[model samples]
Target: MKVYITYGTADFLKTIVKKHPSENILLMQGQENAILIHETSGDTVFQAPHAYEVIDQVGEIKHPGFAVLNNIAVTQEGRPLFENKFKNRAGKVENEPGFEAIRVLRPLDSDTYVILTLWETERAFQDWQQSSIFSRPSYVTTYFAVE
Candidate 1:
């Protein structure tokens, strides 16, 4: 399974979504942003136009069982501290139990950001949720399950 979370306006998306490189790529639209997930055999590459800011590579993983996409809003004053939290602990999660890959995106244009965390299983992700060691901002979360 693979995941692609894109940030842009609906009009912008309408222009480029159809041009995505992979077929059967599911699209989930939020109030403004969009999320795409698919089960192509190899890595999914997107053909995004200049108006679209594709944050991450089509997030291809070894075994994408469960994933979380979190959209966070922060004040300008809180931006540095929030970003620092991740920077300080960048390499620590590699040893974390059940962890697969984590990506955090902070777009230069806005205070809003997105975080994508992938896990080998739902139980493993739940474990992190219940006992998350680091502090996090209150943000709206979206979850995905890929077989």
Candidate 2:
């Protein structure tokens, strides 16, 4: 079965989203048969990063979830120009732990940021895609979407 994974940040996504390289993650994993699609919606005007604690609690998935990473950014300061730390480890987005290692576009200063990621399977997609999995800590928000 070929899984189609797509995700992006809410703010500042319009400009930098084009730079997102999620497809590479899928290809590298030997899942060349799969199709990875990247899409964006909403505005950086309301990027909310309230889903980290849940991300911390998330562990490795066995099945249903793709081996890719899913992540979200909080604000405008997370851009590569600032040499920030949030999007630093992005190169490793396709690892086992997935987007848990992501740290970009934080909401520390600005309201316009982005949430980008490379998801692995449909299971992880269902759980992590929605902030509901991390509903308790409330570290996630609807900063990105897929349909």
Candidate 3:
């Protein structure tokens, strides 16, 4: 799937979204700006940072959950290195309780890649932190999707 994303201030995003409404749009907010993500075939109204490809995905992303995105950057020479570890990752996370979805995305333009993981709840994410084998995201954001 092709996903486009851009980070813009709340006021700026409001104007852009109003001008370019999209049924496919999804919002993930942080203290600074809201990350707007949408699918193909539309004129991206925000910064139009990059279009991402879902190289790998597992499970369905449902609402009333927490979504975590780990944004990573790597050079062309090390792109495969980033992908290699994920493709070969132990399936431990797959069996974890509260785990909902995971998507390994590749950038069509930039060197930034995304690892999106969904959790049933915030507490579930906390549990993973207490018991799991991951941390230190190059850049990460967590958003609560209430539906």
Candidate 4:
């Protein structure tokens, strides 16, 4: 499936959600912007501000208390290698306390990929971060569940 994302005012996001009643478009509030993430099925990916293909995922994708988006810029030549790395990942995050979901995204327009993870609390995410068992090309952005 592909993930479509965008940022705007709360009303704008609400309007967008209403337009796609069939899709579970998650609405969220980030530090500075209102956010929307919709998982759609298709072979194409477009940038409605930001969109991606889900390369890998774990757990269910409902809104959690908090979310972390780790953005990585990958070279086109290393696509297979990168995908294999995730495919063979240690296979452990699901059991972690407070963990909710994780979605590794492949961008359509740029080299950057986003690793979106949801958690019940910030401390849970911080604990995982302190454990030091993840990648390095990430630029993290966080968000809060809305309603």
Candidate 5:
């Protein structure tokens, strides 16, 4: 599994990156925030919270609404429950406008995972966030690419 963090300012996360040095820390070119890619030895080390958050961009964009990153924290025991519910509702999002792609990411730790969704604009992402399938928990801060 891969863990990445994107935020507004790379300086804010500098300390964090330094403390928890990972396999790769990529700073976006001409972008405000930086992305940290970490490679863990095993799943137990990386722990995610029991909630999820969808990070949205500040403004609109062309072609794609930029990108949205959802960080979901589900325990090992909750995986089945989460998957079943998400799988059924996943199709509903496909029909939404500006929709591009949705992907599920699992960390080395079985307890934590993430969801990545791409959209054509910020409006489209916001629409999805307001939809029924948007309900979830939150703890960890999700980082989305910004203009």
Candidate 6:
């Protein structure tokens, strides 16, 4: 459940983050890389985090063509549904062992989010999936669809 919550509810989120700085949150901006990468390569946050850091370090590395079709979703609201959904998702990660979740601030006005974590490998991510409570319901997917 290492995920990021991005929306238009700044004030409301500020209070919550103040109480929970470990929460990963940001504004909306997923126009290029996120959309493309998630769709093509995979939907795990770990991959992009790995790629970005790699690009940052490697400098001007060429990305594979298929990596440009991934899609990421974000919403611009600060309502109960958004809060509770994100909280429950985030709550799971907070309790996970050996995981570090951090808020990622994208450029303002760009609805983008990526709650990152550094685990041993992608297999660790799969382990999180096996945890019984990780039911990603329709509400989660439908709410964040990029329209």
Give candidates' CA RMSD values in order: 7.7, 13.2, 4.5, 3.8, 8.6, 16.0
| Residue 45, candidate 1: C-alpha displacement in angstroms | 9.0
Local distance difference test scores for all models: 0.52, 0.31, 0.68, 0.76, 0.47, 0.29
Question: Which ranking of candidates, highest lDDT first?
Answer: 4, 3, 1, 5, 2, 6
Q: lDDT of candidate 6?
A: 0.29
Name the lDDT of candidate 4: 0.76
TM-score for candidate 2, please give it: 0.26
lDDT of 2 by residue, 1-147 (tens): 112233343233333334544321222122222222222232232134222111111222122223333333332432444334433444534344334323232333333333334344435545644541121222233222222
Model 5 per-residue lDDT tens digits across residues 7-81: 435565455556655434433212334544332333312233222222221212223434554556676667667
Best by TM-score: 4
Better of 2 and 6 by TM-score: 6
Q: Give the TM-score of candidate 6.
A: 0.31
Q: Write candidate 4's Cα lDDT for 23-110 as tens digits.
A: 7778878877877878778522223557688888887777688888877777778767777777643267777789998888888877
- Model 5 poorest 10 in a row by lDDT: 53-62
What is the TM-score of candidate 5? 0.49
TM-score of each candidate structure, all chains considered together: 0.53, 0.26, 0.73, 0.82, 0.49, 0.31
Q: Which candidate achieves the best lDDT against the true structure?
A: 4
State which candidate, 3 or 6, has the greater TM-score: 3
Report the C-alpha lDDT of model 3 over 37-119, residue by residue, as the tens digit.
66555455556466888777777644526777778877777777778777643266667789887778888897778887778
The candidate 3 region of ten consecutive residues with least summed lDDT is 129-138
Window of ten residues with lowest summed lDDT in model 2: 52-61
